[PDB]
């Protein structure tokens, strides 16, 4: 925002890489310096946080409760946006279509805040609007939810009314994809034990083989193969 303009005076420059404000006493108050001193730190914060995360990176709380009409409630919680972590204190719940993909994601919702709107911010050390009470205004940006805006801070996608993917904690899954595939790079489509091709008539459906099979355990694609069951699966008689 052009907060550079009065009343807000905000002279900060991230691309100078300004890093402190350096004052003098006895002061008439050219307060650009304060607007700036805050924003100075918030750029380095932004740099340092955005190395770690994408806008919509989910942290804590943040289960979900997809309703039957398909208003997705997401259970409230900590979520990353654009330099920083913010709490989705909202349960703000959105109609997903329940068909194809559904790009669930946030807007942080800009409102500029004078004490003149917000009398709770007017000088309660004396007669309330008592003059001191216009020291500063604010910005405010509470998060709010959207779907199929991929440019929103995208927290999820839901596929055909499923959450499309379920490894919530996920850094071990890189490792898993890797190791299972190492269980494929040497070799990895194998019977470790079991599975072999016996027979049995389905007689309930007397028109199929109820194929009798024991347990087996294995890897295929080097991903873990594990079907221990007393098996009888119908395929038609010849």
């Amino acid at each position: 925002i052009n907060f550079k303009g009065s009343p807000y005076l905000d002279r900060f420059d991230p691309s100078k890489d300004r890093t402190k404000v350096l004052f003098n006493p006895d002061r008439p108050l050219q307060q650009a310096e304060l607007n700036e001193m805050q924003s100075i730190d918030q750029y380095y914060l932004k740099n340092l946080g955005d190395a770690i995360f994408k806008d919509g990176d989910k942290q804590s709380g943040l289960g979900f409760t997809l309703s039957e009409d398909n208003v997705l409630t997401v259970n409230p919680g900590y979520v990353y946006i654009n330099g920083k972590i913010r709490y989705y204190d909202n349960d703000d719940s959105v109609k997903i279509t329940g068909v194809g993909k559904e790009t669930i994601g946030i807007k942080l919702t800009e409102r500029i805040v004078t004490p003149d709107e917000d009398a709770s911010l007017l000088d309660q050390t004396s007669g309330v609007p008592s003059y001191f009470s216009k020291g500063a205004d604010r910005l405010e940006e509470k998060m709010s939810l959207t779907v199929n805006d991929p440019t929103s801070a995208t927290i999820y996608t839901f596929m055909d009314g499923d959450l499309y993917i379920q490894s919530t904690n996920a850094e071990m899954d890189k490792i898993n994809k890797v190791l299972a595939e190492r269980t494929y790079d040497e070799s990895g489509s194998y019977k470790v034990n079991g599975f072999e091709l016996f027979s049995e008539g389905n007689a309930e459906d007397d028109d199929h083989v109820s194929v009798v099979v024991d347990a087996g355990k294995a890897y295929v694609k080097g991903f873990k193969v594990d079907k221990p069951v007393s098996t009888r699966i119908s395929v038609p008689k010849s």
């Binding site: 489509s189 019977k191 091709l197 016996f198 027979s199 008539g201 389905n202 083989v209 694609k221």
Partner: protein
């Protein structure tokens, strides 16, 4: 007979569903990992 082209599903053997019926026969060619099959052929010819 067992030489098959699916990469997702495994060449174990055959269930061989019979005439008018259901049942298995695999006196036939085959494939297996590191050929544990060949390593069994050696054991098998040691049974011979």
């Amino acid at each position: 007979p067992p030489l098959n082209t699916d990469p997702e599903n495994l060449q174990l053997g055959t269930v061989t569903v019979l005439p008018d019926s259901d049942e298995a026969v695999c006196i036939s060619f085959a494939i297996t990992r590191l050929s544990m099959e060949d390593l069994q052929k050696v054991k098998t010819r040691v049974d011979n």
